[PDB]
Nucleic acid binder design. Sequence first.
RNA 1: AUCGAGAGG
Lengths: 114, 180, 196, 133, 49, 160, 65, 43, 773, 264
Amino acid sequence: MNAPDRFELFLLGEGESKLKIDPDTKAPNAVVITFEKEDHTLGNLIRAELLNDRKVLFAAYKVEHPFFARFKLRIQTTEGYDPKDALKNACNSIINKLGALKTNFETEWNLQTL
Amino acid sequence: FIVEDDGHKELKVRKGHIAKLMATEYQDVEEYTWSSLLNEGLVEYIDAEEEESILIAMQPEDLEPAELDVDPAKRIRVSHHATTFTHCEIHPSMILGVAASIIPFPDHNQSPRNTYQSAMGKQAMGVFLTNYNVRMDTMANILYYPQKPLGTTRAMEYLKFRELPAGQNAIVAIACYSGY
Amino acid sequence: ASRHGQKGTIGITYRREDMPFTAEGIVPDLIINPHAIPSRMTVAHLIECLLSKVAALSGNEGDASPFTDITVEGISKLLREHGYQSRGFEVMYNGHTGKKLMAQIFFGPTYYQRLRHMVDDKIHARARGPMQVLTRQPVEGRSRDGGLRFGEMERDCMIAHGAASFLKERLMEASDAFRVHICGICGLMTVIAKLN
Amino acid sequence: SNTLFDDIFQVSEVDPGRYNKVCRIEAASTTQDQCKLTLDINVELFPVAAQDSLTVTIASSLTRSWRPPQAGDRSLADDYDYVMYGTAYKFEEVSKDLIAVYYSFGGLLMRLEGNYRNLNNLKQENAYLLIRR
Amino acid sequence: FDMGGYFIINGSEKVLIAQERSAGNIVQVFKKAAPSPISHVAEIRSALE
Amino acid sequence: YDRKVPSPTGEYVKEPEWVLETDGVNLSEVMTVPGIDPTRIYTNSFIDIMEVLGIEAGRAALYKEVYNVIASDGSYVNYRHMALLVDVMTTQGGLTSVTRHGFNRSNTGALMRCSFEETVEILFEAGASAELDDCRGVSENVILGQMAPIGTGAFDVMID
Amino acid sequence: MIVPVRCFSCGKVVGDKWESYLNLLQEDELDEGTALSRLGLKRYCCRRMILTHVDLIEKFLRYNP
Amino acid sequence: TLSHLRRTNTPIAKPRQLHNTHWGLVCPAETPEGQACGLVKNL
Amino acid sequence: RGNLMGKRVDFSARTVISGDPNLELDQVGVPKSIAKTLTYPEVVTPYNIDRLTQLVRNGPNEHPGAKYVIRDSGDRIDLRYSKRAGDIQLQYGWKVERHIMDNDPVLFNRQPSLHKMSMMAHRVKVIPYSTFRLNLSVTSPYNADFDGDEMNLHVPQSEETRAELSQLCAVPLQIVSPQSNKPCMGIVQDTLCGIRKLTLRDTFIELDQVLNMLYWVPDWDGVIPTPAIIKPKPLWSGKQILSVAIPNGIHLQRFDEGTTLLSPKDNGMLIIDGQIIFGVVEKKTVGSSNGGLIHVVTREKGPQVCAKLFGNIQKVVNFWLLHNGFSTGIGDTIADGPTMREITETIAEAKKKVLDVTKEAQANLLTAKHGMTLRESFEDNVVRFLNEARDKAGRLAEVNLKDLNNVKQMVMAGSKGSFINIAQMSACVGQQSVEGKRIAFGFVDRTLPHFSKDDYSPESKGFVENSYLRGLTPQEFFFHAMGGREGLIDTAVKTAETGYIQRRLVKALEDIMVHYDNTTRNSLGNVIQFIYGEDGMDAAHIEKQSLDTIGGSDAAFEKRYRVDLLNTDHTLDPSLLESGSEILGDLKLQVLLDEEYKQLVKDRKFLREVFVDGEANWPLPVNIRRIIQNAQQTFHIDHTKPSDLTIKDIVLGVKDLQENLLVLRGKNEIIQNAQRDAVTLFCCLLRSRLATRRVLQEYRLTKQAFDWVLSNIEAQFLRSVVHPGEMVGVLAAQSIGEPATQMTLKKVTSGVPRLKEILNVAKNMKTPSLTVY
Amino acid sequence: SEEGPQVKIREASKDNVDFILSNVDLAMANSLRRVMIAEIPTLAIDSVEVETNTTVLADEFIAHRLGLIPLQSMDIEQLEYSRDCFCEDHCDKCSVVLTLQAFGESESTTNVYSKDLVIVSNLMGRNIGHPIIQDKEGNGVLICKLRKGQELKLTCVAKKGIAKEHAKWGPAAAIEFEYDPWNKLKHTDYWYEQDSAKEWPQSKNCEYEDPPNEGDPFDYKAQADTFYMNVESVGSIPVDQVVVRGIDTLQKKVASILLALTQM
RNA sequence: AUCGAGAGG
Ligand SMILES: Nc1ccn([C@@H]2O[C@H](COP(=O)(O)CP(=O)(O)OP(=O)(O)O)[C@@H](O)[C@H]2O)c(=O)n1
Ligand SMILES: [Mg+2]
Ligand SMILES: [Zn+2]
Ligand SMILES: [Zn+2]
Ligand SMILES: [Zn+2]
């Protein structure tokens, strides 16, 4: 009845942006991004790869309500380092890691016989 | 059941009678029925006033003569320390009604909660009858995929609840996840 | 509700990926709080989880008949023979993190009953609506699109709060407000009034 | 910003208070009867056997938001193996010509009693504890 | 599986509760309160066939 | 009963004291008998205390026993609420009760009284009495629908 | 009423196994759990659906209309 | 259905309380809540 | 009764309820359909005309749409069906009925209306699911548990009504209860257990966790706390992150058992400047109890900060708990075999004692006891034997339970459970009670048919030796059923009786209100109380404070409160006050010191008359411990430095504060005397904590600190005064009513029947009695 | 082989594959699991219209079953989301149309099986929509048994879907996760009455990792790089392809985030 | 509308 449709989790609505960027008040080199129509899956990975970067001082993701599929990521970086660039490098590293794993697994499966 | 003298004082009902009853169940040989036992005199009907004159035993094994090492988990059962038992109860669980018979291990739980469940089993959804599609009830609810309970009271087979279950054996975890 | 007297509404619905998962990948259909159990003192719910798990791995029925000598230690021995933990606790990993859970979670099969009470058949809201004639007051019940009663015990709560105007609004403007003409000399509504 | 107090102690006893991770430590100043120390420590991070002698140091500095050590261009404050930060709750006079110092490193508690210093460990929330092997 | 026992009146299944009643033709002695002129009573409720 | 009494040093110290408990109470002969402190004697029944000593003493006993009822369950209530109820029963001088032969028999407005019990009887007596409601009472205004004086309605608000 | 397609916890299809399972019990005179293991359902999520199931459909079939 | 079929009513000196005589004849725990507890029981 | 005093109201809603941790406490989750149905009228304003036009364009079907539009002529316009719905052109003065939207005032209620707390205003947040949603901490004032609970919501239709709901009936305002002088709402359940678990010293958080948990705080500064442990690794204390949750400037001291400053047990709480110095958070620390963190934060920082504090603590603790996990299983109930054998030994010893006492009764050797039948004495002795046996079995179980046992964790946090539950699960449940007695013989001279006639042994008597885990024998199960049945009949009957009692109290005291003169009066104007509560102070601001004068020896009182200028040792030491060397041996100062000492001695005699028990801890208007602590932190206080305080100013300023504090403003002497009597006890407390020796030595006070303390005491006392127009009588009746429902159960009438006798002023008590001294 | 994560496979079947993920952050493993079941697309029926139903079972129940019916989704990439094409209700590229008609001709009960399913829409040379049968007999999953004189006739429209929206578009049932089998990382604390080792079972995954020694200290610095995983397949997509497709789905989401940042 | 029955916290 009152329940929203399932497709709302993975489909963006009208006047909806996947990423909305707003600097964090009372903080240096810090910005909060509202990732929209996205779940824990992406947020935790982005956080981990952000933590690996030395210049990124702060990284965290929060879900305000399990009802609504969105997650907020706050990033703090070293001076002269834009948080968006750090997110880009971390994401690129994620993509390269996933590609390397898919190649290695494909070779292993080709080795595997059954 | 009836308990009389025989040189140990023993219950009237015996194993061969049980075998004839089971054979009657199997063919479902001369019929052996409850009316037979009542006519045989092996069992008797007792009213509340009549009970006041009689002495009853919960377990048939209590009658066996008394003459150590035991597991701690078994419930503390008082040594009966009694004799001249007129009769023995068929099974204690028979004191429970139909709604209480469905509750599993009520011996291990607080009684008021058993009362509440007996109130709830009426409200629980289920397949009310096999003729539901033919029948025209004012309101009716039926489970999509009824499942027999994993833990069954021995009284359930007579209750037909296993045949016509009203719940689902769902996987349940006891944990605090997200506080909801 | 379960057969042991534990009753609970669905707080939230969660997808399988969000749910905590055991190492085997089995995901609980439902989550119940530890806190409810101690006060109610229903051990047989826990016992049913244990025995039902033994039965599921055994392919045989479980007897929860009253006044039957079944040892919890023996059931736990059979569960140990199966390899699952004797007390029913199981190693779990948090779903969103993928991290292991510091506290092992007791989870297993348990019979549960859907109940006749349905939320959407209970939901009701009125706003402006049909009115009874004699009382000139809102009709009663969801089935008649009726209005909820403001109890006199509720008006006492409001007087304790001291919100006189809100009390008047519920008492007249949200209910049988009416305008009548009274003659001073009669002191009664004997006056007959042609308003235009 | 200089180091305030330094002393050598041999631990009198180690007691686990129903905690596997943390045990309380009872010790006294070596070569001085003036002061004794009683502080809880996480043994898993750093294990201290009983009757061992361990260097103890307290420094004011070397709040600004904490940053990961990362490259370590910032010179390590301690060659020591163990360091904690805490805030003193109270300071009291245990006896005439005797002072007491009460510190709380995140709920973990330290107690230092002595007259050895007439003035030191002022009621400044900043504290750093350095323990060598 | 239907066990029966329900009358069918006007298309509605109807079932009769049993009413508990103290048995007739039983005599019992009943005590009387402290503010009572008479100390005890003995009452028999005689039931016709 | 354990009694905490001042020591000569001034410290409160506990020394046991013998006390007597009775199943019945007449309370007028009892207090006069010697060997017992007239000042310390206590009764479980208020009404006998009110007859024996005075209405204020009965009010104090009322609060004492209400407090015992609250304390038996572990519950605590600020003294003001219980005291207010006890004064409402006490202010008449008689031991007025929380019942129909209580506040309803009082001289308050009939429309307030009619809500509790004996509605039409309060109304027919008022009609015979020609009693006029002050309309000050909250129940009167709630029935009337006019805003009762409840904090918000207590003060008139005029412009400068 | 009829064999569930898949276990709600497990997620694996379970409808295909049931006919074979009943045949295995009747022809081989074997324990139900051994039949479930032969069927390949090794997890109690997958197993509860087979064991607890009641095939009401057959009784539903009996009615002539 | 079966529990409604086996019902007792005791219309109305402590009827609500379960009595020793009820053993073996009445369910110990099955009773409606509210102002019917113990007054109505099931065989 | 039913169409005038209470009536059906338009704009009513009701649903099944469920709780959301992420939803803020003041908010209520309102299903979107209910918002679509319910409407609030809004006169068109230049400020809202754009929003209103857009809302009417959205239409009734989707929120923030609107349902009806009202013109200046006022003829209804229906949006669901109208040809002109598209052309809508707002004209000034027209009204727009509109959907209920987020952050709009409503009233939320549970159907039992025992308390004004049960009906209070809530912020609105619209949600897409059928259930009403509310915080876990708001359950307690309503008494709502989400098994099947149903709750009602009402919507204001006028601006004045909206203001009345927001300003007086909002949840933050009713945080601290008038009755019981303690906060209504506290941290419950999962947050309670997790707050204990996190606060444990063993618990150590990690940088990823601390960063996420810090982000989770909505008002978080972004200031990253320095790790408690640094060199081996940076690990933050759980206490540290919870301290990040605490508002800055809040100080809390609680001492329990051996709460040393070293606090090895970690018992008690030490909090400075919104950071816990030591202690493990538990129920008393974070619960509804008086002296709780809720009370202090509401009293000093404000209601809204505390209301946010509930949510922040809730979010932090729930996240950490979800990542740590919690469970409860059969193994928690199991006890060790040796302990089980000790339990069996306890039962056997009780059985032997019962048999021997029964033999004593049989032989008539047993001594007579005055005032009771010998059989009555026998019953008392056996009952006490069995009760002690159950308690002892529980004791051995509690020792047996390890720290890991989760039921123990619930009890330690105080979230749920008690000692009795543990005993009944893993030890002897014990003797059943029917009608205040052990099981009787319904059968002739036998409790049950299976027992032999004339058996008084505990098993026949209904004493249930086996545990719930052990399983109950059939006879024991039947006896337990009798006991439970009596419990249910009692619950129903007491609910009915309590409803009648509460209605009668409310109707009796409803008219009672504090008028502007502060005289508690009925409608007729007959005075009930000349000063409400006899002090004229709001009960929420009153908190338990100790009176130092009444307790202690004369010698200790003298040493603590007396400084004699004309003595070598009695005079204040020069380090305490710089002018002390000058002040020594000055008669003109000693006369004022002697005057203050005479006042304190008279106050000690006065309080000692009032309290024979001499209990110092009593409800008092303004807490002074916290205000002294606030002075020490607000102005940094150095022990070494001598104070800059003239003794004259201390004494004279305490006096000046005494005449500044005001309950009744009248000039006339009768009102002045009523004021002096009203403020008398508060004045004694003030003198006790403002003693010159105390002000100089225990706290190293300064002149600015003392002046601020004086002004703050004045302001807090002024805030503590009741406000005219308050309906004191209704609040009193409800305050008595709610605890009465909670009551549930050697010859004393007690409980609801006793309360009924008290209210009925019945001529004959069921158990009259006289206690003679 | 390449720098970065490596996988070693202990064993593999067409239905299941057990491998060891290595040199990986755990958050990636959990994101991968949630993608592996939640996010990967699969084809299943989202519309059913029934001409005739003589079965005792109601149509809605059958439609739910048909949703849960397993169909091949190997070529699902060629197919387009029903919302993402330009058709009216179903493009021939976007949906696959199935038909089922059965009558109780036999006096004995006639049982519908998944093999009794008729594809009408053009195949387009795409290995899509074939009913999946793993039965040894080859008979499909039993939709309904029909007595003599009973018939059911219906049309199904199957569309591309994601398992988050509904469980039917799900490739896999469950997955097996293991890390720190010896509990060296001590991420969890065992609950024990007498001894943790006896009361808690020892997994086969424990043997692969080197046994712990009591003398060596707890490694605070250590983090988990080795994880043990197993994957189960319904058979709609082969196992190797489901794990590779999960990797690809996650990388697609990351690339979408990058492209959104570029748009900003 | 009336009367009644059952149920929920
Ligand atoms: N006739 C009735 C019956 C119930 N109620 C209300 O329903 C709540 C639920 O508790 P409840 O009914 O379960 C009794 P409780 O002691 O709280 O046990 P519990 O811990 O399992 O909740 C009660 O606290 C009452 O306020 C009522 O207003 N009138
Ligand atoms: Mg409830
Ligand atoms: Zn007139
Ligand atoms: Zn399964
Ligand atoms: Zn298409």
